[PDB]
Design a protein around this ligand. Sequence first.
Ligand SMILES: Nc1ncnc2c1ncn2[C@@H]1O[C@H](COP(=O)(O)OP(=O)(O)NP(=O)(O)O)[C@@H](O)[C@H]1O
Ligand SMILES: Nc1ncnc2c1ncn2[C@@H]1O[C@H](COP(=O)(O)OP(=O)(O)NP(=O)(O)O)[C@@H](O)[C@H]1O
Ligand SMILES: [Mg+2]
Ligand SMILES: [Mg+2]
Ligand SMILES: [Mg+2]
Ligand SMILES: [Mg+2]
Lengths: 132, 132, 129, 130, 131, 131, 125, 124
Amino acid sequence: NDIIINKIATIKRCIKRIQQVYGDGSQFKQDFTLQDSVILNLQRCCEACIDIANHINRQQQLGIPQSSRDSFTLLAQNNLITQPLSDNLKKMVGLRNIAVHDAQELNLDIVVHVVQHHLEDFEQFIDVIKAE
Amino acid sequence: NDIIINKIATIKRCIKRIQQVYGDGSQFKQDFTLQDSVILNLQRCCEACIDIANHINRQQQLGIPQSSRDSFTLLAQNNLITQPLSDNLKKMVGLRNIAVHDAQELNLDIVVHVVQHHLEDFEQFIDVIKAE
Amino acid sequence: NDIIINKIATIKRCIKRIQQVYGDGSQFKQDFTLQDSVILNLQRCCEACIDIANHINRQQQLGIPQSSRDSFTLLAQNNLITQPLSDNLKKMVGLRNIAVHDAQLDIVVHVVQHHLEDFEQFIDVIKAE
Amino acid sequence: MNDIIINKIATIKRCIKRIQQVYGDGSQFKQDFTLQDSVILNLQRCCEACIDIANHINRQQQLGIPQSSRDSFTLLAQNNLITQPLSDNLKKMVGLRNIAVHDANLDIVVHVVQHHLEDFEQFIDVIKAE
Amino acid sequence: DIIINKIATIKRCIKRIQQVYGDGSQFKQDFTLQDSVILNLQRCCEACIDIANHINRQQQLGIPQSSRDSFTLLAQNNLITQPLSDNLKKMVGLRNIAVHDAQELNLDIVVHVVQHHLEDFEQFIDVIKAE
Amino acid sequence: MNDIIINKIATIKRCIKRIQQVYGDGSQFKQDFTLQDSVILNLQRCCEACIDIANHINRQQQLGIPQSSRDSFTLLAQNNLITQPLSDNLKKMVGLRNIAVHDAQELNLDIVVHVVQHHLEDFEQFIDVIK
Amino acid sequence: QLNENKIIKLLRDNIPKLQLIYLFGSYSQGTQHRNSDIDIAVLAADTLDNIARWELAQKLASALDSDVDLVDLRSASTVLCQQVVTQGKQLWGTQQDDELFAVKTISMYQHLQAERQAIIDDVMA
Amino acid sequence: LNENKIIKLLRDNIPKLQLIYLFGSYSQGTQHRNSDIDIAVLAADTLDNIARWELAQKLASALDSDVDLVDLRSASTVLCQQVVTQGKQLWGTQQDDELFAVKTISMYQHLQAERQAIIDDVMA
Ligand SMILES: Nc1ncnc2c1ncn2[C@@H]1O[C@H](COP(=O)(O)OP(=O)(O)NP(=O)(O)O)[C@@H](O)[C@H]1O
Ligand SMILES: Nc1ncnc2c1ncn2[C@@H]1O[C@H](COP(=O)(O)OP(=O)(O)NP(=O)(O)O)[C@@H](O)[C@H]1O
Ligand SMILES: [Mg+2]
Ligand SMILES: [Mg+2]
Ligand SMILES: [Mg+2]
Ligand SMILES: [Mg+2]
């Protein structure tokens, strides 16, 4: 419990940090530092989600992940998280892997869509881990 | 190599993005967004360093490193990079982990010291790899 | 090595799935889907052992296994596994031929009750590097 | 005519029925591994019974020594005992003995149940006429 | 149709065995007495195999690999009980050796079938008629 | 002739004599079923011993393993170990046996009498040919 | 190719009151391809225990370095006994025991064919 | 092993093909009798699970051996690492191979840090 709650806080903090830095979104598309902040707090969100997943896979011996995406696959296979949520959380990993490098393979439209209609997925994930 | 020149270009851009965001450092310790932008561009410098090390270790057949640190260690054993620089780049990966995965435990006094003094460790690595 | 890690996990998974499916034994003799699962998972443990054995023979340069059974003789000859363990793992190689080929359940139950420990014994000696 | 041909045909028929009975609609299939395991084993049993019928016909009719399980179907097709499409389809099933074990691929299993069970039935009917 | 004729033959043979047998003090000595029941016991077996094989054919149960299998297919498909199936299979052996082969001292088992196992044939024809 | 042949010949000799005891004047035969049941059984025992001889020679002589009793005599006839008329009379004998044991209600009874009086030496001819 | 002496020795050393040993697969015909099964049939005074039989099949399999199918003729079907009598090669036992077994199974298979003919015809359209 | 036959079948059937690798026993030399040929491919798009299987069976028929065809775009990081380390490149530019390796090794190094605890717990 002690580590799962610590990671829940970091997601809650990072979600709020995204919302604060993005705000209206008008200035976001032009200001690079605003993008750099949002990209990092999105990375911290899915990295803390993998950290939670891997802890459940460890305490319940669900399996050994063959990929970072596999961390959510094991929870979905063991019916701990719903299949559409698993697919969404695996899409977040994809964003992290591209965004870990320089903003040259950029898709600001994809970053904006995650802030607008996909931050709910991280919150939805917290709502199912709390039911231990 | 074309992959090496592309990664060198990445480090150059991100070093300049740190210098611009930090500026004078008067508002750095106060603003979270300036911290977030510096930490993301430091990680991008680290990843492009690890990617160069990984590429040279595979292409020159020096071994397969199963960790970011082993990749720098392997370069030092084969005398491609100097050992004090290897341990400096290894400590930079160390800072990257605590700055991203455990940002609350992060001490900015170390981050500021990296921006002001240790930001040339990447430039030193950029030149020693340029001399083929 | 990931081959060794993932194959050990496969054996662990298959043993947990055999024990789960078999249970007490009452329902086993009446449902063919339970028999089929236990049988398929036994073959899976067997091939995962053969795969681990072949990987060790190759890396440690013990020899060229000339058969599935020979993969276990080479290990025993190099005192990596005991002769009774080798002899027991070789007994499992014949299981694949029991399901797929009709060729005209007591053996399956005997194996579930007494020879699953042989696979667990094999994991343990491999984990001990 | 031979008891091998009769019994191996009987095995395929029984295994096909059991594949159809277990799978059904396919709803409970992707959840229970017990139902998946049964289908795969009975599919492996169909592959083997076919290869065994092929090997028996090649020996009896003296068509040559099969150099592999796939070559067994090639010798039958070469003598026009089975069509080239049938030969190629039965050969695709030869690779199905390897899917269950050396892996961990359920979409493939479902595809075979829905579209390739007909191949075993086609082969049974072809062999029936001696 | 063939099952009805086969059931009718079984009843005819059991009544034929009971008529020839009756008392035990005329069996162990007379050979024509032994020969009459031994044939009608075989006739009971053979007709039970035929009833079984007609059901196996109609319902498509499988191909018997032995004469005993005719009853096994019925039990595996829950048409007759395992204790009945096992009793009928034990009766096939009686038909096998003790009937078409000269034999020696199998008479003690033949009398045991007459006084205790003629009911197994009756239980079978009653179960089959019931469906 | 090996043990199997000797033991099977001895069965035919014993069962032929057994038919002769059960068939004296043959007047009360066509009225009593007990006498018919003994004659039919020992004729089947005589038939079965001849099949067993034929099956043994076909395997030993590598002529092939017959699927049926009829095929056993054809195999013996095809490799000239027996004559076609003997093969045909012995095949007629086993055909009689099948009607006599499985379809007693449709058995001719007149042919059974004709078999005992005239065609009973067909078994005796087979014993001599194989000897 | 195939050590028949090893087969005879191992079975004689492990089966009490052993009467007959037969080789009957592809090996008995010479059609023995690579990665083949060794098919052996035995007849002893008593029916072998299923587990004891399987364990012995694996003991032979280790010694011969090949999959071994061991059949107890005392419990085998009439169809399988007929396969052994037709394509089988006797490795051990008396001619008396072989000839007695052969005539017992050929007769039982002939009676079986009479019974199941309609079933066979019906399933073979 | 006819590598030319392998290159032709895959090029003729996979659109926008970038890389062809030979891995497993055959790439090392441990290629025995009942050996399974292992091929890893990378194209612009992912290959459908059904389509890929049917293609492996086409190669299997032409090579007279079981073939395991792996789509690098949808395979695990563990599998990709096995291909970059043990595999032999049969087709594709030197650049594409290098780009694939850099992406793979980085992703695998990151996965090792994430799952180290799970690895330790099972391996005791
Ligand atoms: N379903 C069956 N019904 C009857 N007899 C069978 C059946 N399957 C196998 N047999 C017999 O058992 C023998 C050996 O079986 P099997 O090992 O499958 O074949 P094989 O000819 O030895 N081929 P192989 O060992 O692969 O080279 C056959 O030759 C048949 O006589
Ligand atoms: N469970 C596993 N985990 C990780 N990698 C695996 C696993 N199984 C197989 N592999 C990889 O896939 C390759 C081919 O698989 P496999 O066919 O089983 O091995 P192989 O060395 O080619 N032996 P073989 O085909 O029997 O001669 C291996 O060499 C590994 O690199
Ligand atoms: Mg064999
Ligand atoms: Mg076999
Ligand atoms: Mg392989
Ligand atoms: Mg493979």
